[PDB]
C-alpha cells in the first residue's frame, strides 16, 4: 500500500477534525484527477491550464526533486534543463488547474530530496521533454536508481557534505578532500540518532487514514 505523503500530517496541536475535513476534499479532487504514485527521483509530466499559454495549456516534464507540504496545499518540484537553462516549477497537487499528472518514469533515489542537483553537473538534471513513458510492471518493487552524481566545484548553494543533510547520492570522493570531509564531521550529532523522544510514529495515524480512503472509495 502506498499512501501519498501529503496525507500524513506533521506533528502538532491541530485538532484531528481539521485533517479529516481536509482529507475529504483531497479525496474528492482525486476522483476528478488521478494523482499517481511518485517519489523524489521520478520523471513526471504535468499538464496545466494556463490562460496565457499557447492553446491555454502548458506541459512541463522534469525530475521531482522535492515533495513538501501537507493537505490540499501539498506540492512537488519538477526540475529540468531546457536550452541549457536550469528551470524548476513547484506544482500544487490539488490546484484545480492541473489537468494531468503523468509518471513518465517511476523510480526512487538514494535521497529524499534532490535539491543538490542545482549544484551537480547539468547532465544529471537534463531530461528529454519528449521522452516516452517507461512501463511499470504490476506488483513489482519500485526501482531505486543508485546514481551518485558528480558535482560542480564549490561553493555550492548549500553545504551538502554537512551531516544534517545526510546526502548519500553525491560522489563526495571526487569533489572533496579528506580534510574537507573531516571538517564537516564537526557538525555531526551522533546522539540525535538515539533520541527516542524525537521519533514520530505515524503507524496508527496511517491505519485510520487508510480506513477513510477505503470508505470514500466504497461509497
Amino acid at each position: 500500500r502506498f499512501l501519498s505523503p501529503e496525507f500524513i500530517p506533521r506533528r502538532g496541536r491541530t485538532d484531528p477534525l481539521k485533517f479529516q475535513i481536509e482529507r475529504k476534499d483531497m479525496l474528492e479532487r482525486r476522483k476528478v484527477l488521478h494523482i499517481p504514485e511518485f517519489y523524489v527521483g521520478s520523471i513526471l509530466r504535468v499538464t496545466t491550464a494556463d490562460p496565457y499559454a499557447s492553446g491555454k495549456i502548458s506541459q512541463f516534464l522534469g525530475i521531482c526533486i522535492q515533495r513538501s507540504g501537507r493537505g490540499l496545499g501539498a506540492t512537488f518540484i519538477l526540475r529540468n534543463v531546457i536550452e541549457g537553462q536550469g528551470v524548476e516549477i513547484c506544482f500544487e497537487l490539488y490546484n484545480p488547474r492541473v489537468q494531468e499528472i503523468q509518471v513518465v518514469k517511476l523510480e526512487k533515489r538514494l535521497d529524499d530530496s534532490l535539491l543538490y542537483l542545482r549544484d551537480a553537473l547539468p547532465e544529471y538534471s537534463t531530461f528529454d521533454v519528449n521522452m516516452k513513458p517507461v512501463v511499470q510492471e504490476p506488483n513489482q518493487k519500485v526501482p531505486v536508481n543508485e546514481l551518485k552524481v558528480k558535482m560542480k566545484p564549490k561553493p555550492w548553494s548549500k553545504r551538502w557534505e554537512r551531516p544534517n543533510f545526510n546526502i548519500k547520492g553525491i560522489r563526495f570522493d571526487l569533489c572533496l578532500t579528506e580534510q574537507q570531509m573531516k571538517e564537516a564531521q564537526k557538525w555531526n550529532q551522533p546522539w540525535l540518532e538515539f533520541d527516542m523522544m524525537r521519533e514520530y510514529d505515524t503507524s496508527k495515524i496511517e491505519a485510520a487514514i487508510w480506513k477513510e480512503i477505503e470508505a470514500s472509495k466504497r461509497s
Binding site: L17, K18, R29, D50, P96
Partner: protein, 305 residues
C-alpha cells in the same frame, strides 16, 4: 479552610461514576435545546435596514487553501461553531448604551472548574458552562430567547465578517521584534548595542512622552480582522471558511460578527434573520454551501478557453 477540588475526597469507585454522571447530564442539557421553535421562541421579525443581528463564537481549526474559477489561490481559516448558545438578553434600556445586547457563549467546559455564581447562572439557564462569553449589540427586532443554539449557517457564503480574538502571546519583547525598530549595525565598532531603542526622547523636555514605544509585553490582546469574505459553510460540521487569517492560535475562541465596514452595510437582507433555525427550515441545507466563485473539490478541472 483548606482548598478542595471536585474529586479530592472521592473514592476510586465514585470518580468514574461522577464523571459519567456530569457528562451525561451535559449531553442531555445540550440535546434539550435542539428545537428552539417548538419551545415558544420570541417573535421572528423580518429584516429591516439599520437592523443588527447576533454573531457567533467559533473555534479556529486551522488554515486551508481554496481556488476560485479564475485560478487564483486564496487561503481560508476554518472556524468551527462549537456549542454556541444565546445566554442573556439585555434590553436597550438596561444596557446603558444605545443598543440592546445579546450575550452568546462558546465552548463547553468543566462545571468543576467554574465559579459558583457562574454555575448558578448556567443552572438557571439549563446549559453546561461555556468557556467564552461575548456581547453582541443588536437591534430590538433581532432579539433571541436565551438558550437558543447558533450554527455555522447563521452566516452565508459571499458575506463579510469581522473576527475578533486574542493575538498570540509573545511575552516581553524588545523594540526590534515589537515595534520594528532598526537596531544598530552588527560590526564597525558597536559596543553592546545591536537591538536597543536608541534615544527615547529629546534632552529638552527632560522626560519620556506617554505612549513612547519601549520594550514590553507583546501580543495576547484583542484584535479584530475586518471584512473577511465567507467563502464556504459546511453545515454538517458547522465550519465557516473565512478569507485569509484571523487573530490568535489554532483552537482558540473567536468572535464572528457581520462586518461593520461601510461597503457591507445593509447586506443582511438575504441573510438569516434574526438567526438560522435549522429545526424550522423546511428543506435541509446541503453539507456545503459555496460562494459562486469557488472551485468546488469535485468540480471539473479549470480549463481556460
Amino acid at each position: 479552610k483548606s482548598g478542595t477540588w471536585w474529586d479530592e475526597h472521592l473514592s476510586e469507585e465514585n470518580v468514574p461514576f461522577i464523571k459519567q454522571l456530569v457528562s451525561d447530564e451535559d449531553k442531555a442539557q445540550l440535546a434539550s435545546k435542539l428545537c428552539p421553535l417548538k419551545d415558544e421562541p420570541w417573535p421572528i421579525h423580518p429584516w429591516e435596514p439599520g437592523s443588527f443581528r447576533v454573531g457567533l463564537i467559533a473555534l479556529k481549526l486551522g488554515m486551508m487553501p481554496l481556488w476560485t474559477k479564475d485560478g487564483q489561490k486564496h487561503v481560508v481559516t476554518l472556524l468551527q461553531v462549537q456549542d454556541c448558545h444565546v445566554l442573556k438578553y439585555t434590553s436597550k434600556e438596561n444596557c446603558n448604551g444605545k443598543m440592546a445586547t445579546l450575550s452568546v457563549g462558546g465552548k463547553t467546559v468543566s462545571r468543576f472548574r467554574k465559579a459558583t455564581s457562574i454555575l448558578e447562572f448556567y443552572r438557571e439557564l439549563g446549559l453546561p458552562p461555556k468557556q467564552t462569553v461575548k456581547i453582541f449589540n443588536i437591534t430590538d427586532n433581532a432579539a433571541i430567547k436565551p438558550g437558543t443554539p447558533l450554527y455555522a449557517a447563521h452566516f452565508r457564503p459571499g458575506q463579510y465578517v469581522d473576527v475578533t480574538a486574542k493575538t498570540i502571546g509573545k511575552g516581553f519583547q524588545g523594540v526590534m521584534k515589537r515595534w520594528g525598530f532598526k537596531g544598530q549595525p552588527a560590526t564597525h565598532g558597536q559596543t553592546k548595542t545591536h537591538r536597543r531603542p536608541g534615544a527615547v526622547a529629546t534632552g529638552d523636555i527632560g522626560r519620556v512622552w506617554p505612549g513612547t514605544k519601549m520594550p514590553g509585553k507583546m501580543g495576547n490582546i484583542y484584535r479584530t480582522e475586518y471584512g473577511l469574505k465567507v467563502w464556504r459553510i459546511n453545515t454538517k460540521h458547522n465550519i465557516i471558511y473565512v478569507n485569509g487569517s484571523v487573530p490568535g492560535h489554532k483552537n482558540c475562541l473567536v468572535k464572528v460578527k457581520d462586518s461593520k465596514l461601510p461597503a457591507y452595510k445593509d447586506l443582511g437582507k438575504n441573510l438569516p434573520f434574526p438567526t438560522y433555525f435549522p429545526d424550522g427550515d423546511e428543506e435541509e441545507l446541503p453539507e456545503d454551501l459555496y460562494d459562486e466563485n469557488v472551485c468546488q473539490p469535485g468540480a471539473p478541472s479549470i480549463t481556460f478557453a
